[PDB]
């Protein structure tokens, strides 16, 4: 009785009533409850994971001989979680000079991959020359048999995305099932960077090819970084690719799709500053990603909105 | 439980002895092709058909009545009549009953419909 309701735990007139347990009965537990055991939820935090590497790990496997031999050259290149500020010109000079002296293929290529990664972080454009000078001959040209070491490919790809470069499309294509079959070994961050670059450059077709492979190779869709999905989708103006992207959008999860919308509305919105290159206007893809989000969320009832104009009829 | 286009092509080239593909298309006027290894029980007859003895069923439809263990795949234009037929086959208790939605339309590229039903509701 009142506008303030009784709280059923603290009130003995609830607790000890006939619909609950009186204090003179024997007070044991009624039934056991196993909730967590029967059907358990997987852990997904609202906050992203604080320790994760957040980059493209380039996997440095060197024989612990050349690793010691080449130390004064390698000390200038990135080691794990450490990014020395050495100017990229110098590093490339060192590779060009000293590398023909080393005899190992595997070593020369690990070293090269480090150089590429280093040049990806500084966004120096003259590093593809290195690909055409050493690797192109035995990997990409005229159906050469040789199969490049994975780390090298990851590194070059990462470089083509960081420095936006038409070249990526040629490399990526070699990684599908009939080629090197490297695509299932890519990191989630790899996909993230790829999508973002392709999106900036604006290839709907690059975007489609990449989303198809990602899906087939079972990438982690929900953990692909939202910004990069948005920038990729934003690039899609062509009727067919557009169709593809609706049908595809059904592959994300409820949550992912909600934040695809949030992120999208921010990047053309308040957070338009957050990007190094501003987005381009897609009103169509924006509207659609919002629409999709609305379709996939639970629906709420707002009767004064729906039935605002309802009039009954006696027909 | 569903059966997709992939399963359908596979079963065209590589049939299983005790899997039956049963065509539910109702009107003979609309059916010009034959789904490979299929048999014809039109939807309209199903409730009766499934209550025949093995012999009687043989006499009425001219092929052996599937046992209740065997796989039964159902077929129609859109996948609607095949569904309703499925409910019939499931109510007599048949253990494996699969409907192939989009069935004859997807197979042959025909656009036909089992029933004329439209998505739009007439305003109340």
């Amino acid at each position: 009785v009142g506008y303030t309701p009784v709280n059923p735990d603290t009130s003995p007139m609830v607790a000890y009533s006939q619909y609950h347990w009186h204090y003179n009965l024997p007070q044991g537990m009624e039934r056991p409850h196993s909730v967590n055991r029967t059907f358990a939820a997987p852990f997904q935090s609202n906050h992203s994971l604080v320790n994760k590497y957040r980059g493209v790990w380039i996997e440095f496997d060197m024989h612990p001989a050349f690793s010691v031999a080449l130390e004064p050259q390698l000390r200038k290149l990135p080691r794990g979680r450490t990014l020395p500020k050495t100017p990229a010109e110098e590093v490339i000079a060192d590779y060009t000079a000293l590398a023909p002296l080393v005899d190992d293929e595997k070593t020369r290529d690990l070293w090269l991959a480090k150089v590429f990664q280093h040049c990806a972080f500084q966004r120096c454009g003259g590093a593809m020359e290195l690909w055409e000078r050493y690797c192109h001959q035995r990997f990409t040209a005229e159906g050469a048999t040789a199969k490049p070491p994975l780390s090298l490919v990851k590194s070059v790809l990462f470089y083509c995305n960081k420095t936006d470069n038409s070249g990526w499309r040629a490399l990526f294509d070699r990684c599908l099932k009939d080629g090197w079959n490297y695509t299932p070994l890519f990191d989630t961050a790899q996909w993230s960077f790829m999508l973002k670059s392709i999106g900036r450059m604006g290839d709907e077709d690059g975007v489609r090819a990449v989303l198809e492979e990602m899906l087939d190779v079972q990438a982690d869709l929900d953990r692909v970084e939202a910004r990069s999905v948005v920038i990729a989708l934003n690039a899609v103006t062509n009727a067919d690719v557009y169709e593809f992207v609706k049908k595809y959008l059904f592959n994300f999860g409820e949550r992912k799709v909600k934040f695809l919308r949030t992120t999208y509305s921010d990047l053309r919105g308040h957070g338009a500053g957050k990007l190094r290159i501003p987005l381009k206007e897609n009103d169509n893809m924006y509207y659609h990603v919002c629409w999709h989000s609305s379709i996939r969320s639970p629906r709420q009832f707002s009767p004064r909105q729906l039935y605002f104009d309802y009039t009954p009829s006696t027909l | 439980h569903q059966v997709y286009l992939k399963d359908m092509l596979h079963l065209m080239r590589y049939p299983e002895p005790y899997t039956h593909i049963i065509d539910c298309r109702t009107s003979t006027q609309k059916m010009h092709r034959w789904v490979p290894h299929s048999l014809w029980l039109p939807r309209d007859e199903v409730e009766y058909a499934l209550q025949l003895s093995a012999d009687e069923f043989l006499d009425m439809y001219g092929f052996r009545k599937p046992d209740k263990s065997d796989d039964v795949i159902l077929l129609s234009h859109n996948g609607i009549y095949s569904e309703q037929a499925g409910w019939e086959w499931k109510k007599q208790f048949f253990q494996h009953v699969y409907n192939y939605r989009g069935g004859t339309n997807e197979l042959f590229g025909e656009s036909y419909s089992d029933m004329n039903v439209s998505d739009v509701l007439s305003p109340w």
């Binding site: - | 092709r33 042959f108 590229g109």
Partner: peptide, 21 residues
């Protein structure tokens, strides 16, 4: 709101197989 996307074209899936055979 349906249909969300354009339905698959009329393509005939049985013909190519039985033709190969």
């Amino acid at each position: 709101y349906t249909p969300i996307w354009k339905s698959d074209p009329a393509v005939d899936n049985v013909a190519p197989l039985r033709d190969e055979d």
